[PDB]
Amino acid sequence: GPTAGKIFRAMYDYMAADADEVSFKDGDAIINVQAIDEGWMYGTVQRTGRTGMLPANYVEAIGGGGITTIKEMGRSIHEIPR
Amino acid sequence: IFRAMYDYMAADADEVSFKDGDAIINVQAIDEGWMYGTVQRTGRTGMLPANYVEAIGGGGITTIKEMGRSIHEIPR
Amino acid sequence: GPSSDLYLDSQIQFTRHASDVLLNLNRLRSRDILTDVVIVVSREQFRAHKTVLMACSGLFYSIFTDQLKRNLSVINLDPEINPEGFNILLDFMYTSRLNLREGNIMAVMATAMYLQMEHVVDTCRKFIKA
Amino acid sequence: LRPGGGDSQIQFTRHASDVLLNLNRLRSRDILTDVVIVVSREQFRAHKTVLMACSGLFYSIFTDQLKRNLSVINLDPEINPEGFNILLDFMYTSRLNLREGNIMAVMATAMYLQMEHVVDTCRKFIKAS
Ligand code: NA
Numbered sequence: 116g117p118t119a120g121k122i123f124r125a126m127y128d129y130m131a132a133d134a135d136e137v138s139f140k141d142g143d144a145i146i147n148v149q150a151i152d153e154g155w156m157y158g159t160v161q162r163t164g165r166t167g168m169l170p171a172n173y174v175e176a177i178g179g180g181g182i183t184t185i186k187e188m189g190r191s192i193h194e195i196p197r
Numbered sequence: 198i199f200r201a202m203y204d205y206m207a208a209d210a211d212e213v214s215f216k217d218g219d220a221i222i223n224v225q226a227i228d229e230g231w232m233y234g235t236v237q238r239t240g241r242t243g244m245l246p247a248n249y250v251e252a253i254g255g256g257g258i259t260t261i262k263e264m265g266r267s268i269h270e271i272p273r
Numbered sequence: 274g275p276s277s278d279l280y281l282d283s284q285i286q287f288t289r290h291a292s293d294v295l296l297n298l299n300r301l302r303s304r305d306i307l308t309d310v311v312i313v314v315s316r317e318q319f320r321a322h323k324t325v326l327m328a329c330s331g332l333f334y335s336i337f338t339d340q341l342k343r344n345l346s347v348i349n350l351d352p353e354i355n356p357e358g359f360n361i362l363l364d365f366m367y368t369s370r371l372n373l374r375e376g377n378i379m380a381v382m383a384t385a386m387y388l389q390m391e392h393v394v395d396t397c398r399k400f401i402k403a
Numbered sequence: 404l405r406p407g408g409g410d411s412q413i414q415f416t417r418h419a420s421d422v423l424l425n426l427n428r429l430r431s432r433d434i435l436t437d438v439v440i441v442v443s444r445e446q447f448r449a450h451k452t453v454l455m456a457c458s459g460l461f462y463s464i465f466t467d468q469l470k471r472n473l474s475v476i477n478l479d480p481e482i483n484p485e486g487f488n489i490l491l492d493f494m495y496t497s498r499l500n501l502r503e504g505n506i507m508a509v510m511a512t513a514m515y516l517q518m519e520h521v522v523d524t525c526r527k528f529i530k531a532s
Contacts, residue, residue, distance in 0.1 A: 193458075259405050268418065297455075324435050325452075369414060373413065
């Protein structure tokens with residue numbers, strides 16, 4: 116069945132420093148990530164379709180299960196007698 | 198006011214139907230078997246059997262629910 | 274083996290926990306357990322927990338965080354304070370219920386003003402004009 | 404609206420939660436805390452009244468005539484401090500913060516503290532029945 120996943124999103128603007136890097140803007144989806152290693156990742160900026168190397172410290176991961184709140188309405192603790 | 202003690206289904210259009218626990222208001226005795234009043238939940242007014250309702254005694258205290266903050270907040 | 278029946282971060286919020294705690298604090302007060310202060314109001318004495326008093330009252334918060342009164346297990350209120358009004362407010366602190374029998378609203382409001390319990394004062398203002 | 408005569412009771416529906424929040428604020432600021440609980444390498448400041456309100460074990464300790472005035476209590480050596488911290492936070496916030504990696508420790512600590520309703524809630528969380 117479907118599972119909780121995680122995606123990657125740029126946090127800051129970046130201009131590529133070489134032909135193997137890609138430029139992106141704050142908020143860009145970074146998709147089909149092939150690897151993350153030592154401050155660099157290889158991925159596709161979805162808005163432009165360009166694929167290459169990105170500085171990993173410019174992108175954040177979003178997703179997973181989060182923290183789910185469950186409500187319990189029963190008595191929580193012992194009652195001290197009167 | 199009066200409170201219904203049982204469910205009742207109107208037998209004709211001049212009777213009212215109601216459920217156990219309904220409040221019946223503006224009540225009037227027609228005879229010692231029958232009353233005329235309004236079912237507050239539905240707004241319907243008509244005849245109902247007297248033995249199906251009980252008068253609620255007066256003089257109770259009033260309970261008021263206050264949902265706002267009750268006390269000062271101690272800062273962190 | 275049999276089925277484990279185990280579900281392969283959660284926050285469980287106990288919606289009546291705070292009211293259960295406060296009830297038990299009032300049960301402790303009724304049995305005089307861990308009470309650490311007596312409040313003296315004219316000829317009348319009321320034992321309580323400092324932490325509950327300071328949670329509810331600006332006046333008691335100032336008293337129990339005043340370094341000069343750190344050692345005090347007896348607190349004397351101003352002689353103008355009505356002990357019946359104080360008892361009503363103390364019961365409110367420990368129960369969430371403010372008892373307003375006929376004719377008592379001004380004494381309760383005045384007690385709440387002295388105790389610097391402004392949300393209670395505001396509720397009394399609404400009450401008295403309705 | 405109300406009659407000009409007669410008696411009234413105002414019920415403050417969020418008072419208890421407002422009190423508990425203020426008790427937690429006093430704890431966070433170390434105001435009127437009167438006990439330290441030691442759990443392996445870790446120490447936790449608290450108010451005895453809140454502990455007694457929430458735990459059968461602490462209720463028994465602090466109503467014992469010859470233990471009421473202890474100010475430092477070591478728990479048994481198997482007690483896990485992460486579990487204890489989670490339970491202490493619950494006492495002061497009504498929120499029991501669980502992970503699959505620490506739910507067993509929370510449950511074991513709640514059993515030790517005699518917090519049976521919390522144990523019961525943990526049982527339901529872990530296992531269908
Ligand atoms: Na600690």
